[PDB]
Amino acid sequence: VAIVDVGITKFGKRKENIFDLVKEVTEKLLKYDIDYVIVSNSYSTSGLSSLITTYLNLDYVPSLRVDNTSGSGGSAILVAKSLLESKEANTVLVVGVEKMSEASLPSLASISAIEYMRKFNAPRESIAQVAVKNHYNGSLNPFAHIQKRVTLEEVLNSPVISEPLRLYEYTPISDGAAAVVMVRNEDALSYTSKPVYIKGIGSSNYTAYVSEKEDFVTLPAVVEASRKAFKKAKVERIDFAELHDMATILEIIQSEDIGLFKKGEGWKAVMEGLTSLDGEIPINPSGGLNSKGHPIGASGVAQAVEAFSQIRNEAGNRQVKNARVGLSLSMAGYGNSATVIIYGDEP
Amino acid sequence: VAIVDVGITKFGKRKENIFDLVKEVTEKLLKYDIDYVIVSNSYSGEFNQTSGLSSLITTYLNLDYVPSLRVDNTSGSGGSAILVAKSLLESKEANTVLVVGVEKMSEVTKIISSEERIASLPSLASISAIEYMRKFNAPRESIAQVAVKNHYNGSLNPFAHIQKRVTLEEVLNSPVISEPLRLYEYTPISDGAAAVVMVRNEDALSYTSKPVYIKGIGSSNYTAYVSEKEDFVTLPAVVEASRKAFKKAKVERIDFAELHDMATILEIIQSEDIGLFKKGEGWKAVMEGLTSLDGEIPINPSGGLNSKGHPIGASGVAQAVEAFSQIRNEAGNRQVKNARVGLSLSMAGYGNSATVIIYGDEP
Ligand SMILES: [Ca+2]
Known part of the structure; x- marks a missing residue:
């Protein structure tokens, strides 16, 4: 289709x-x-x-x-x-x-950030850098809720939501x-x-009981959904990904869980610039939830609009160079359900 | 499937x-x-x-x-x-x-006129009952008899919210909800x-x-507000859904139907709109007994919404459970004789959306 x-x-x-x-x-x-x-x-x-x-x-x-x-x-x-x-x-x-x-998600996001920094020795700034990148991308997106470039310092100085994560690292109500x-x-x-073309879709749930979730640095629903999607799509490579970054730390974790980077190495890709608009694998060229905003029911559809525009070379200043294959991830709760969709210019 | x-x-x-x-x-x-x-x-x-x-x-x-x-x-x-x-x-x-x-x-629908009013589903049903009796000369008893039949069927259904037989007199003496329709003619909150x-x-x-087997499914919406241009005696979404279902199912005959009888009058109107009876003839089928459990075309052998009750999201699935049991000869005292092909109708609002499913013992 x-x-x-x-x-x-x-x-x-x-x-x-x-x-x-x-x-x-x-x-x-x-x-x-x-x-x-x-x-x-x-x-x-x-x-x-x-x-x-x-x-x-x-x-x-x-x-x-x-x-x-x-x-x-x-x-x-x-x-x-x-x-x-x-x-x-x-x-x-x-x-x-x-x-x-007209256990909250923000709280779970800070628990993941603490545990990820602890387990993988990731600097605090690698997590905040995700918001810098995404605010830059969102500033190029005329539909984004937030169209304002921010420095690392501005992100790290923005009001605390759930220690250590700050305002500029979370998606707004939209x-x-x-x-x-x-x-x-x-x-x-x-x-x-x-x-x-939709090349493949994968769907998975995972335990919604906070107490029963195995850890907070992996999202097994995203892992499973991605595995299913790639199997059905018969590709192993993508040119860009739109992820479900309700908090910056989630973009990192999701980039690992979809298979781009090894567990605990996603932060390195951020600092290296691999995931920026001019990098080898742009993540959230839209600005992500971070800068687009997140109207609950709209977001998963907006990602498909992004993939359509990118693959057609119609994304303007946000264009991912030579984009032919893309991925989106739509996620309920803290990884309670995930759908991964792979798009391409061929069936 | x-x-x-x-x-x-x-x-x-x-x-x-x-x-x-x-x-x-x-x-x-x-x-x-x-x-x-x-x-x-x-x-x-x-x-x-x-x-x-x-x-x-x-x-x-x-x-x-x-x-x-x-x-x-x-x-x-x-x-x-x-x-x-x-x-x-x-x-x-x-x-x-x-x-x-x-x-x-x-622990509703907008009404316009060529000003807005919000109307409850029970108030719309009463407008339909009045218009149906006026247009087709249907006696009041024909509409009430639907609740007699359905309470009888429901008394044979151990899962039904209401499992109590009622007489025509009891129905017609139960409290007025929206004139002329009475409490026993409406589905309870379940x-x-x-x-x-x-x-x-x-x-x-x-x-x-x-x-x-699902032999075919048909789906249609219809205008989600009521205007004075509606006839109040036809549910066009039901008509269209049923047309599509029968086209796909390739049958012209069913053995039983589970309908969406939020009010008794709706059972009559829907029995017409699915194609069993001509417009304004459905009441005759009730009085003739055609639609009773031993009749030629039992409607709502489950008790219908009238006696099953109506847990909003459960009802359309419950009708599939009924069809499954009937076609497998597992419905016990409620069994429709030699049931091989059946239909269900799941309807949103006062006909805003309808899905009609045809079931059979063969693919
Ligand atoms: Ca196709």
Whole structure:
């Protein structure tokens, strides 16, 4: 299956209600013969999915809502892919949207940062450097909630959230929406001469009991989901990755868990610049959750919009040079569920 | 794809929390090599900032690595969840899907005119009953008789919220909810869970000697607000979903139907919209007994929503459990004679979305 067109809007403190966010992101996608709408949304208003199809003048088109909290967008893409491949649908619109304006995760993130620094002798600044890189990338992203470059000192001086992690290292609460149109491979070239194919998806959960999680430097759901995705995609190399960096430390851990770097060496890739926009393997060229902001149900879909734009050479100043294959990770809770999607310019 | 095993709880006002309802319904199903869990649930969003319901479920059930997600289409959630499971199987994304429908409820639509009003589903049903009686000259008793039939069926269902026979007189003397419809004609607020295990057809006989195949599914939305341009006697989403299901299923005949009878009048209207009876004739089938348990076309042999109760996210899955039991000749006193092909209808709101599933003893 392939993504053939997309919609995105600016994330942040938005004037629009949930329905108008959806109308904005899908305005240009209703020209196609959409035959299922999958809504990725966690917090909604009742019957959001039917309210949406009526609001869009798609009154008869069937819809449903997929919720996997912060992993909703990836799960929704999986459902869309399966609807297409099973031939239940031919042209699926996936819209992720959240309106947020109208043992906690931050706490677990600081526990991981402490344990990672302890086990691997990683300097504190390697974790903060992730926010420097991501704020730089986000400053190039006209849709990002935060578009402000920061130095290491500014990150490390920003207000404490959960010792040692500071404000600039966490994703903000955000409103926003993102959308993709997906079709089977046999249909893809009728829509565009450059479709972005889904090569493989992997999905996994892991124990949600904080007390039962084996440690805090690995996310076994991300490991498993990645393993499944790469197996199905039949590749072993990617050109960029959009990760689920609710805190900076998570980008590091996830970069290891998807298979890019050995466990405890992800921080070295950060300091080396391997993961910067002009590095061998850019991570979060969008700015990541760090700078994009994180409208819960939208994020997993926004990552697919990023992969589509990057592979098509349409990402402008944020362009990953010669990007042909990419990866996204959508994650619920502290690794409670993970979906990894691999995209490419070939099926 | 086929349903190869099921689970069901008693519906009612339950003291158990949602986790223990899910543990109960799946306790005999965890032995299978489940590789995706789909949770059908509409109102349990309390964990949305911490752990998340579908992930809390796989953890509670010790299915730690198995992926899961929640499908919400309000009262139509169970049918939508079954469609998602079918597609995951047919696309080969999954090989054995567990669908759990669950709701723990115990503890609306906009109306425009060519000003806004918010209306409850029970108030909409009464508007339909008045218009249906006016347009088709249907006697009031025909609408009440649906609740007699369903309470009789429900009294034979050990899982039903309500297991008490009522007379026509008792129905017509029960408290007015929204004139003219009365308490005994509406579904109660219920807690409960239901579950199915589904696999591809090529795998079905590996799991059971008597698989119950999904012959086709049809899905449609319809306008999510009510205007004075609606006829109040047809549910166009049900019409469209049923058309699609029968087209795909390639049958023209069913042996029984499980419908979404939030109010008695809806059973009548839906029996027409699925194609059994002409518009305005459904009431005649009730009075003739065609739709009773021994009739030519039993509707709601389970007791329907009227007597089962209606745990929002569980209902659409419970209807699949009913179809499975009926087609396997396992429904006991509620058994539909020589049942081989069946239908269920899972409906959101006042017809905002509908999923129609056709089941059979053959692929
Ligand atoms: Ca395809």
